Amino acid sequence: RKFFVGGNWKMNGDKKSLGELIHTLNGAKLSADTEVVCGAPSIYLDFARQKLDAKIGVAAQNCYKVPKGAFTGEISPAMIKDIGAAWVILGHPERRHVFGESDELIGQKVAHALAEGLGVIACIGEKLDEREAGITEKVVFEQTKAIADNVKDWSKVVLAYDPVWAIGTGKTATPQQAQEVHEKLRGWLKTHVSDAVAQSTRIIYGGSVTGGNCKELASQHDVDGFLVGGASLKPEFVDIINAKH
Amino acid sequence: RKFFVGGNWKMNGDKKSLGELIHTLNGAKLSADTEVVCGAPSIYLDFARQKLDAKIGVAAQNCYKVPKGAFTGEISPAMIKDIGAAWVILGHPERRHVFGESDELIGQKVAHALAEGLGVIACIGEKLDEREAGITEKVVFEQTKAIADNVKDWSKVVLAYDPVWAIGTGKTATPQQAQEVHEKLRGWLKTHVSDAVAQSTRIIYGGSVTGGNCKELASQHDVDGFLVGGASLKPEFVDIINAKH
Numbered sequence: 001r002k003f004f005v006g007g008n009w010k011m012n013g014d015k016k017s018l019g020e021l022i023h024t025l026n027g028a029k030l031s032a033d034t035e036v037v038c039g040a041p042s043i044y045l046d047f048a049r050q051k052l053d054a055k056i057g058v059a060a061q062n063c064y065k066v067p068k069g070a071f072t073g074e075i076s077p078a079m080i081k082d083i084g085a086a087w088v089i090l091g092h093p094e095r096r097h098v099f100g101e102s103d104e105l106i107g108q109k110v111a112h113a114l115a116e117g118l119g120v121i122a123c124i125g126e127k128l129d130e131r132e133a134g135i136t137e138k139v140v141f142e143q144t145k146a147i148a149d150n151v152k153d154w155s156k157v158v159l160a161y162d163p164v165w166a167i168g169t170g171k172t173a174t175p176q177q178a179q180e181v182h183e184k185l186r187g188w189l190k191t192h193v194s195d196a197v198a199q200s201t202r203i204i205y206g207g208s209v210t211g212g213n214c215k216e217l218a219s220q221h222d223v224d225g226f227l228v229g230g231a232s233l234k235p236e237f238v239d240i241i242n243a244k245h
Numbered sequence: 246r247k248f249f250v251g252g253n254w255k256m257n258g259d260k261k262s263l264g265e266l267i268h269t270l271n272g273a274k275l276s277a278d279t280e281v282v283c284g285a286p287s288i289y290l291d292f293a294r295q296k297l298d299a300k301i302g303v304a305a306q307n308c309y310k311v312p313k314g315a316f317t318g319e320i321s322p323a324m325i326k327d328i329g330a331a332w333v334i335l336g337h338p339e340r341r342h343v344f345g346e347s348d349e350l351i352g353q354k355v356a357h358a359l360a361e362g363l364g365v366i367a368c369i370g371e372k373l374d375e376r377e378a379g380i381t382e383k384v385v386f387e388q389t390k391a392i393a394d395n396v397k398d399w400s401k402v403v404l405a406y407d408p409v410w411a412i413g414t415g416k417t418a419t420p421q422q423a424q425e426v427h428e429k430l431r432g433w434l435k436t437h438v439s440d441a442v443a444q445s446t447r448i449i450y451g452g453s454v455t456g457g458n459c460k461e462l463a464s465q466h467d468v469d470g471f472l473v474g475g476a477s478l479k480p481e482f483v484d485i486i487n488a489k490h
């Protein structure tokens with residue numbers, strides 16, 4: 001499993017600051033062993049793909065489930081591909097809780113993006129009241145199944161364990177809590193899909209990952225990378241990419 | 246009131262086909278008396294703005310209510326202005342009924358796009374069941390009010406009456422049914438805002454406008470232009486722009 005690091009710019013940037021950020025990234029010393037993808041605002045996807053080194057992938061932050069049609073405000077996987085992007089982030093928790101995206105919609109988007117040849121970084125994670133109610137497992141397994149039931153080819157899927165309570169709060173999950181969930185997801189994969197899928201699929205961690213935080217998270221056996229929010233907008237992002245060095 | 250025509254491309258095109266379409270608009274003979282705006286998919290806004298003649302405006306099909314933050318999949322007015330677009334379409338029936346945007350949310354979005362310097366094409370419209378119930382008026386005054394409560398400067402606002410039953414169905418409102426709502430909205434503005442706002446605000450009609458239909462609807466006294474979907478992707482778009490000629 002190749003170490004995977006995804007930066008999610010979320011709703012941040014202009015061409016001037018995304019330009020600086022990109023310049024830095026292109027000049028940096030990035031492990032040859034980490035696979036890097038940056039998730040840019042839709043408005044900036046083409047600029048990002050044009051400016052970023054080809055060795056770095058570009059992902060869309062969201063998409064809809066059909067190729068064209070009367071959906072004012074949406075973009076499809078066909079348009080994403082047209083600009084040169086290779087990934088889409090689906091199921092992010094902000095899409096789930098701020099915008100009401102249901103597991104059923106998310107599963108339809110995954111199957112569509114996959115049909116169109118995009119790679120998918122699919123997000124799952126419980127809320128704190130769920131953690132504390134002792135149902136983490138139930139919740140993540142329910143969200144994972146909705147995704148899995150819509151995946152025919154795992155070669156282009158990256159699972160992202162994103163506990164809602166850790167996203168932008170500073171409350172990173174300890175390495176032990178990340179490791180506990182990733183191990184159980186990998187276990188789920190093995191029993192519901194296959195050993196072969198369990199072993200090759202990357203399961204990345206997201207939620208308040210920092211240059212300071214990463215080494216320790218990264219040494220966990222079932223952690224294959226990170227999905228970085230706030231820190232992907234900073235030079236330490238380069239430190240996260242090289243977390244295994 | 247300067248006649249206004251907005252083309253909403255919705256979720257369609259690639260660089261090649263939008264490029265062709267754009268070339269068509271740049272070389273066509275377009276009425277100097279019509280204000281034209283093309284609403285491009287977010288992923289193509291910068292491309293559109295760069296290839297389109299400066300006389301034709303560019304509009305985003307949607308935006309969020311803050312300049313930046315943790316809103317994966319969203320874009321803000323600051324970004325829209327960064328690439329040179331001057332408008333945004335808000336409250337479109339597809340955003341309202343497919344993506345559940347509420348009146349409160351649409352309102353907050355208007356107030357922000359406006360504080361930020363963009364013009365807003367704001368949509369209102371009843372569903373078939375409301376028309377049949379005879380409540381078209383109650384419904385548009387209510388949606389209208391939700392927009393108005395957030396407008397300080399009406400000079401950068403275009404009201405689009407887009408009955409849902411007319412969107413993409415082929416079922417165009419009749420010249421007399423469009424005229425009757427427009428006159429009602431204009432009087433709404435007159436009693437609730439001011440006579441000057443009423444007099445100066447453009448009220449455009451959306452819903453199955455074709456090269457075929459346009460002349461008779463444009464002849465109605467309170468109909469200031471059109472919001473065009475499906476036909477904005479065709480040559481006939483030029484005829485619509487030129488409806489009063």
